[PDB]
C-alpha cells in the first residue's frame, strides 16, 4: 500500500478523515504490509514554519503523527 | 454470594475471603454478575478436571477477559503495561499523577 505524495490533502475542511486515517488504518486492517511514502518534505512541513490560510499542514502532520507513532500494542508489521 | 449459591453447587474456600473480593472490579450491574459467575464456572470447569472446584487464581485470571455490558460496545483499550518503574526515571511526574488520580 502507498500514497503518492499529497494524495492525502483534499478540498473540504477536516481533510484527515477523508483520506489519511482511512488508508493508514487500512494498513493495520491489511495483513503485514508496508506503507510507502514519497516527498514527505511536501507532506509534513515543519510545524514551526506556521502557515496561513487554514494551516492544513498542521492538521495533516498532527493526524499522521498520532496514527503513526507510539505504536503500543500495535507491532503489526506496519513498516 | 447469592449467585455463587444459586445456579450450581459451589464453594470458594477461605483461600480468599468472600467479602471484599468483589472490589476487584466495580463497573458491574447485577446482570453482569450472573454472566460473570457463569464464566467463572465454565472456565475453571474447563481448565480444571471435571471434579470438585475452587475459584482461587482462576477468578483473577478470567476477570481479565471481560467488560460490562455498558462498556463492551464503546471503545476501550489496555496497554502492554509500562509498569511504574519502567518509565520510572524522573519519577516526579508519575508521583504527581498517581497522587492526584489515586485519591
Curated annotation (Swiss-Prot), chain A:
User: Where does this one sit in the cell?
Assistant: Cytoplasm, Cytosol; Peroxisome membrane
Q: What is the effect of changing residue 12 to A?
A: Cells are unable to grow on a medium with oleate as a sole carbon source
Q: Which cysteines are joined by disulfide bonds?
A: none
Its annotated function is as follows: Component of the PEX1-PEX6 AAA ATPase complex, a protein dislocase complex that mediates the ATP-dependent extraction of the PEX5 receptor from peroxisomal membranes, an essential step for PEX5 recycling. Specifically recognizes PEX5 monoubiquitinated at 'Cys-6', and pulls it out of the peroxisome lumen through the PEX2-PEX10-PEX12 retrotranslocation channel. Extraction by the PEX1-PEX6 AAA ATPase complex is accompanied by unfolding of the TPR repeats and release of bound cargo from PEX5.
Q: Which family does it belong to?
A: Belongs to the AAA ATPase family.
In the UniProt entry, what is the domain comment? Answer: AAA-cassette D1 is required for interaction with PEX1. ATP-binding in AAA-cassette D1 is required for attachment to PEX15. ATP-binding and hydrolysis in AAA-cassette D2 is required for release from PEX15 and proper function in PEX5 dislocation.
Complex and partners:
Interacts with PEX1; forming the PEX1-PEX6 AAA ATPase complex, which is composed of a heterohexamer formed by a trimer of PEX1-PEX6 dimers. Interacts with PEX15; anchors PEX1-PEX6 heterooligomers to the peroxisomal membrane and mediates their association with the peroxisomal importomer. Interacts with UBP15.
Q: What else is known?
A: Present with 1630 molecules/cell in log phase SD medium.
Q: What is this protein called?
A: Peroxisomal ATPase PEX6
UniProtKB/Swiss-Prot annotation, chain B:
Induction details: By oleate.
Q: Which domain of life is it from?
A: Eukaryota
- Domain comment as written in the entry: AAA-cassette D1 is required for interaction with PEX6. ATP-binding in AAA-cassette D2 is required for interaction with PEX6. ATP-binding and hydrolysis in AAA-cassette D2 is required for proper function in PEX5 dislocation.
The record's family statement is: Belongs to the AAA ATPase family.
- Subunit details: Interacts with PEX6; forming the PEX1-PEX6 AAA ATPase complex, which is composed of a heterohexamer formed by a trimer of PEX1-PEX6 dimers. The PEX1-PEX6 heterooligomers associate with the peroxisomal importomer via interaction of PEX6 with the peroxisomal membrane anchor PEX15.
- Fill in the misc note: Present with 2100 molecules/cell in log phase SD medium.
Tell me the protein's name. Peroxisomal ATPase PEX1
Tell me which species this is from. Saccharomyces cerevisiae (strain ATCC 204508 / S288c) (Baker's yeast)
Q: Gene encoding this chain?
A: PEX1
